[PDB]
Design a binder for this molecule. Structure first.
Ligand SMILES: [Mg+2]
Ligand SMILES: [Mg+2]
Ligand SMILES: [Mg+2]
Ligand SMILES: [Mg+2]
Ligand SMILES: [Mn+2]
Ligand SMILES: [Mn+2]
Ligand SMILES: [Mn+2]
Ligand SMILES: [Mn+2]
Lengths: 386, 386, 386, 386
């Protein structure tokens, strides 16, 4: 019941099911996973593919010879399973040299090193067939106010993404970039903290059409924001290139719970929107099986991500297909929201006495929105109470 | 000591010192202020001018005759005091007809009414000499997921701002718009919830150059965000048209405390940035004297907004003028942050072996940022301990 | 399907379905309800009873004659419907005299007035058969640090509750008190901000056994806290006298959404706990139908509170009755959590070499908790996917 | 200027200045510190003493022989410097065996192991002269609702603290316990999440007088709570045995910034209260020098903790000594807050017509609190603008 297939386009980072459980107060509770074992185990669970940071796949400092061996082993697992690699990304956050950032480190030589490390992995991502290159600037930011001039940092950030876009276009690569916002952690404040800040920054890049966002459920919720709303704005701008699905219990540290956990109703409205909008990218799970779990709990948690998506997809489809819901949507004037306010144009609106001089403001004010009956229909559908 | 003058460009909304103290659980604790009395009292405190919503100045439903009388009285107070009106805005939030929004109400006739109400007040703002027209979409949003298709709402929002920009340009008005973001309250979630979301939306408008942001200290702090960072991004984009100054104690209801209260260190870094960047707009206080206060407390609170700005301006100037601070900034490589990462260009960076092949990552990793000594210098300056 | 009966003990405040929609930025969108009409409408929806503040029932300033008339009318509606009044409370927050508190106002004469106003309504509550008297100190607190010495305020707060307990015991009344915590709003910070702070304060009162807590879902969530955990601590202490059910979307202003909205999974675990623990008090809904709604939306929202409770009660019962869940609970050692750590006593534990000297810490560390499979069983039950 | 002396009672955990910089996304940026070097370096900065977890001082798994050697080395550093050890604590959070808790682990054998590990370190703490034994239940809690029955966990938690109190009293030790609350991180929710919940729990222990709280600035701020208020309640209950000082920027992950950073005004009101109340315990800094820092930044950060305390102590003393402030406090009726509401007793209050029948509610309502002028005096003192 509710079984995923590779057509559902579910993907997982190596670093997700492979998280050993080391947290700021505790050592690892699980041994490291061979990326080949993860590929095979995820393929049996019905996943469509995997993603990776460079350092998840090739241990940091690997010689060029060890590097090729690690890739060849990985490629063979992809060939044996049919798994794809739709997305890749760079680790610009773990090694101590990145303690003040990569692209916006105050030290110029670290910024150049950061760009060279990224470019090396773009080549590899393209070799493996990735369509999207994600950038999560986890160390770009500050704990104190004088440490970072944010306008200079934004200049440096734009400079880095512009150079990466020059590299991609000069190589003829068919790959696009996706900025993954996060409001804080591990820096006190992280630059481009939300979907909106990333969308606004992109519009200042030399080639804006190469760049979109990879929003994460938990990250926008770490600022108390409505994740489905943020996704709707990304869709409206044409910039939802990729998405990270997981769960988060409000404003606290980045929990990365399995998808469906955390804010369940938000997950429902997210699935409703992705499916209604015809999102056709990967459904990527950026999550961490809790460190209480052994390896069987890891795979149970990963299976749960997929199951919860498929259950919510069924309930959202049932909600939208229900005539009583369709009738309720009309009662709340969702149909009117979709109509132009003034397709008759400015001058017609200015001479339309029914818009102002003869508008009956009290009759309008008295009409109820009927939103609560609509939301209870939505609740009943989610819970399978109809 | 620390006395404001009209050259300091301090401005106040009528609705700020005029807030009667009605909150969701309590009745008014103060009688209504005549806008003429506020103008005269603020001018004696050293303010530079006032702002208004249409309904602050002209009671809702006023005949055209009463309207002219209210304006004429107000104009005479401006002439007697020398006070300016740099900014005006529309009340699209108080009257029950706006309970589901103005520009993005589901009811089309309310949206048209909302546009006509705004256009009427733009004419008045221009008559009074306002340079900036603010839009705070306080009712644009939702409490439940099905109530608002956010993509349709964004279409309607863009349609409204586009029509207003057509109106302004067709009249030849020299006025620009400034969107005031707020993440929530009074709606469960408000559209365009942060500075970043508003900046991104503007880039989809037909005439983006007419529109900027009017960020509010407390609003970005209601999402846990770093307000000086958000202001830096607005400045970097060239979009800080106006700013609302006040105080807020973290993530809760919109307190609108006087400026300097709330997050004091954030206020310091904000003043440092506005003054370093040469912000030359109004320093507008969107605040509410607490309802514990009588009228003398109102004017004490308003004087405090200005005093705290002027004290922080002095401490920030002293901080930046201090040679030991200038030396510390170099020690933390703020000077390197301001230099291009790769002005030698992509190809030079790709063949620069010192950026990767021969980069000594451990030597780089070992260099301390010296951020804590810098921040303690900043703390000592703020507290006048040097 | 899922129909409430008066045996389900669902109750509503007059002020809930009677909220006119006035918020800090907007006027009322609904006319005032006659308390008699609310009683009759709620009884037809299946409610068991109503609660009231004194000022909900008797308009403030009413003569003793008008007072008796208002009570007599109300009593007749209770007799005609069979509705009970299980709980009553005092409005110590709306009138401007309470702007700095009632029990902990800095002005002594306001504190005495506050006590006399409460005592008058205790008499009335007892006349109407109320078992619980709630105290929500909404104005007890401060916006600034010097305004309130909190130790003095706590002395005054204890003095007030002690005098009320003396009054009750001297009259021979069979009524107990329940403190309703709230972390903030309308004060910047409210005293006794959470369930824990109220539980701790009670233990310093002269007659602790007269006092318990009335926790509210949304209030503990306004501090980011786990409401089921807080309820479990109240139960463990024997102090859950009453409970307020509603919904809240994280850390922001007090939304008072209908129960089931907000954090749906938290609502599920709350119902599971109340029913497992055999809570037998009223299921009270302290909620506000959103101001978008007309009167039909009001009653739809109130019906939804009850429906969602009954749906969650069914899913929690199914979860706990499921053998596979019972097996999973054993796999995660919930049975071991319920056993004493050291019923053999201190000396036995100190000489038990298997507890330390020969404890195999790595074998213990390797056992997975199996929490994720358990939580997915809980998710599947909630969603009716088994 | 502002130099600490050992009479200022400033103390530091070994784990604070010794934090290597490993965070959930990054490796260590600093080498490990020898506890002897920390003792000597802190003594030269003017600290009064150090605290430790067992595993900070004796590496986990150390033979009894290595153990004695580690203690002897440490003792010699204390003797050479004059440093005290006022407080000690147990690491029940790092090792994987504690992944589901120590005292409230679901596995009974882990709970017994947890108690034996604690008891071993109590003996050592007493040997070294510690007055307070802290308990921070960082792993006691859950990420999902079914994983932990909170009433059973509270039974287990009480059982553990009761056994520890039996051990202490049976040995005749002069040591008291202090529970350190934290709302979340590393568990999704932690048991006894705030000062209030810990104070309430203590009152159910067999020997409540052995137990108090060790509140941490940042932890209560992680729930959005007012830390000075929480400290005032702890003082009022007589339970502030110890305190952890640091900085935190609102509701997010546990930053542990140096004291004075984060909420500066809250730090001021905290110092004002500790000094006014005559707190005479250690001023303990539970902080982490940011991982951007090298070892010189570590010691600069630690010096800053102490400096900021001493600057704030001076400004708070100046504030309270200022006649104009003393006059303002009377104007705001702080003197009336400190007087009994009804020392004349219940019957006198019931027959006092000036408390109700003849109370002039409108005259009372019209009196302003004058809180804003008071708070601006407090602001001017903090900033040294008088
Ligand atoms: Mg992610
Ligand atoms: Mg504003
Ligand atoms: Mg309530
Ligand atoms: Mg601590
Ligand atoms: Mn995350
Ligand atoms: Mn505001
Ligand atoms: Mn509430
Ligand atoms: Mn901490």
């Amino acid at each position: 019941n509710y079984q995923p297939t590779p057509e559902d386009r579910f993907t997982f980072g190596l670093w997700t099911v492979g998280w050993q459980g080391r947290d700021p107060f505790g050592d690892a509770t699980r041994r490291a996973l061979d990326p080949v074992e993860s590929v095979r185990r995820l393929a049996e669970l019905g996943a469509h593919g995997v993603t990776f940071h460079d350092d998840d796949l090739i241990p940091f400092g690997s010689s060029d010879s060890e590097r090729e061996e690690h890739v060849k082993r990985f490629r063979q697992a992809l060939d044996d399973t049919g798994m794809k690699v739709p997305m890749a990304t760079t680790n610009l956050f773990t090694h101590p040299v990145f303690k003040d950032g990569g692209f916006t480190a105050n030290d110029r030589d670290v910024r150049r090193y950061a760009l060279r490390k990224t470019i090396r992995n773009i080549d590899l991502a393209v070799e493996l067939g990735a369509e999207t290159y994600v950038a999560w600037g986890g160390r770009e930011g500050a704990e104190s106010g004088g440490a970072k001039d944010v306008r200079d940092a934004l200049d440096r950030m734009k400079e880095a993404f512009d150079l990466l876009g020059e590299y991609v276009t000069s190589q003829g690569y068919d790959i696009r970039f996706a900025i993954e916002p996060k409001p804080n952690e591990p820096r006190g404040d992280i630059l481009l903290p939300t979907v909106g800040h990333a969308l606004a920054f992109i519009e200042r890049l030399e080639r804006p059409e190469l760049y979109g966002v990879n929003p994460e459920v938990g990250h926008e919720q770490m600022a108390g924001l409505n994740f489905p709303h943020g996704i709707a704005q990304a869709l409206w701008a044409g910039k939802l290139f990729h998405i990270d699905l997981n769960g988060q219990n409000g404003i606290k540290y980045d929990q990365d719970l399995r998808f469906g956990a955390g804010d369940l109703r938000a997950a429902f409205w997210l699935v409703d929107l992705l499916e209604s909008a015809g999102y056709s990218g990967p459904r990527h799970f950026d999550f961490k099986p809790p460190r209480t779990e052994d390896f069987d709990g890891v795979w149970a948690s990963a299976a749960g991500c997929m199951r919860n998506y498929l259950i919510l997809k069924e309930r959202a489809a049932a909600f939208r297909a229900d005539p009583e819901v369709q009738e309720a949507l009309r009662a709340s004037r969702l149909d009117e929201l979709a109509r132009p306010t003034a397709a008759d144009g400015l001058q017609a609106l200015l001479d339309d006495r029914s818009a102002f001089e003869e508008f009956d403001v009290d009759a309008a004010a008295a009409r109820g929105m009927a939103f609560e009956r609509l939301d209870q229909l939505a609740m009943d559908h989610l819970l399978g109470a109809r």
